[PDB]
């Protein structure tokens, strides 16, 4: 049944928290959550979203790890403390897009792993921009609070 | 019954004693004047996320709270704001325990794990429309007590 912004944030943050093994990964993810929301406001969701995709340094095993996190809940995000933090915030945003039914999971994955589908993903996001920018920032604010509550500073 | 004002007196006693620095007391007074109105307007779960964000439940302030449950001489350590938010979170959890909304047995093995703390937040999410209607007068009493006792900074 329908989960609102804070409940979806709880579920997403819970699936991320168990995957970030090293604690430095967790603290970098905290630093992510604490400012990527103001970034998304100032630069727009699509610019910041592709910035996050790039800074996640996919084009590794990190991609199948990130897609496995969607279902296994036994999966682990692998990479440096910067790469996995951006990878996990990317999982946050993808989880929102999928659960709100804005973009399907298969298309998102295939656009995330294929040179071709990425450009039409840009097209689709420019189509769906109001449906996302309407309310993604409340869910991301809840993510920010969960991060600065469940994780500490350096 | 009006025993929620009594419960507020007990909680405010424990807090007013566990805040040794008077700056922490005044900061708690500020939290009391603000957070009840914010629960009224923005709802419980949003304000609870806001509060646990600014309480910074690392591992140590957490044990100070579990002890403040029992030992009437436990103190809260940290920044004035960092302890005022934790004191208000204790107010909330105290009410939740006494009114038996959630078992203190559960709430204890949650404040010690970070792996059942998220389950604590989930549970509190399953009960937000109950808590929101219950705690109203209790938090109003806490606010009145804080304005009455603690000096305006």
């Amino acid at each position: 049944l329908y989960e609102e912004d804070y409940k979806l944030a709880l579920e997403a943050f819970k699936k991320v928290f168990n995957a970030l093994t090293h604690y430095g990964a967790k603290q970098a993810f905290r630093s992510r959550a604490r400012d990527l929301v103001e970034e998304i406001y100032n630069s727009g969701f699509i610019p910041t979203f592709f910035y996050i995709i790039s800074k996640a340094e996919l084009n590794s095993d990190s991609l199948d790890s990130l897609i496995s996190l969607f279902s296994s809940d036994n999966a682990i995000l692998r990479g440096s403390d910067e790469n996995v933090s951006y990878s996990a915030y990317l999982f946050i945003i993808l989880y929102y897009l999928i659960k709100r039914g804005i973009i399907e999971q298969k298309f998102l994955i295939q656009a995330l792993r294929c040179e071709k589908t990425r450009l039409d993903l840009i097209d689709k996001l420019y189509n769906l921009a109001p449906i996302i920018s309407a309310k993604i920032r409340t869910y991301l604010l809840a993510i920010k609070r969960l991060s600065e509550a469940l994780i500490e500073a350096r | 019954y009006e025993e929620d004002y009594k419960l507020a007196l007990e909680a405010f006693k424990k807090v007013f004693n566990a805040l040794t620095h008077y700056g922490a007391k005044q900061a708690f007074r500020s939290r009391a004047r603000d957070l009840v109105e914010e629960i009224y307007n923005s709802g419980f779960i949003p304000t609870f996320f806001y509060i646990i964000s600014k309480a910074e439940l690392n591992s140590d302030s957490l044990d100070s709270l579990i002890s403040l449950f029992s030992s009437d001489n436990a103190i809260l350590r940290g920044s004035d704001e960092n302890v005022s938010y934790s004191a208000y979170l204790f107010i909330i959890l105290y009410y939740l325990i006494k009114r038996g909304i959630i078992e203190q047995k559960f709430l204890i093995q949650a404040l010690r794990c970070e792996k059942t703390r998220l389950d604590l937040i989930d549970k509190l999410y399953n009960l937000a429309p109950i808590i929101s209607a219950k705690i109203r007068t209790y938090l109003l009493a806490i606010k009145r007590l804080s304005e009455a006792l603690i000096e305006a900074r």
Partner: protein, 173 residues
């Protein structure tokens, strides 16, 4: 594995001698650095009856006891009612952590019988009567940490910290 021995803050004088060596080396984790007792290991679910003060293994999560983790052994004298343990030294519940840890450990717990002869009704208690903490800074905190009264010039902080940072559960059986 480097062995660190466990013992708590009782109020019955079952305190003085619970390890034959005092330090047995030159390492410790329970620091004292003019900032109170760092790294106070807590173990919830075990209550202490100070009459022969030892943790009784309970299954109530609220019944906690938190004491020192000295570097020592069971003196090879009290090894029947004890239970050994090798753990990765992060499965602990330390408090005011200042640095890294061995991640390899051998502790032996003051451990009483499961008390199958009675219901283990638990009693909470706190610490007051500052001489109650002074005489036990004497009873153990001299014969464990020579840095007390010899390198600590502001021990009153450790006084108020043992007073505020220590509470526990008994059975009164």
């Amino acid at each position: 594995s480097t062995q660190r021995e466990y013992v708590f803050i009782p109020i019955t004088n079952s305190i003085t001698i619970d390890v034959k060596i005092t330090i047995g080396g030159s390492d410790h984790i329970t620091n004292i650095d003019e900032r109170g007792i760092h790294n106070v290991l807590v173990i919830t679910g075990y209550a202490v009856d100070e009459k022969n003060g030892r943790l009784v293994p309970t299954l109530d999560p609220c019944d906690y006891v938190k004491g020192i983790l000295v570097a020592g052994t069971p003196q090879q004298a009290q090894s029947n009612d004890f239970l050994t343990l090798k753990l990765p030294a992060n499965k602990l519940y330390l408090i005011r952590k200042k640095g890294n840890i061995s991640d390899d450990l051998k502790i032996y717990i003051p451990y009483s019988s499961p008390d199958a002869r009675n219901s283990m009704k638990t009693k909470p208690v706190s610490i007051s009567d500052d001489t109650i903490v002074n005489n036990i800074i004497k009873e153990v905190f001299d014969k464990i940490y020579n840095i007390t009264q010899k390198e600590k010039v502001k021990i009153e902080k450790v006084k108020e910290d043992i007073k505020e940072l220590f509470s526990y559960y008994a059975l009164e059986q």
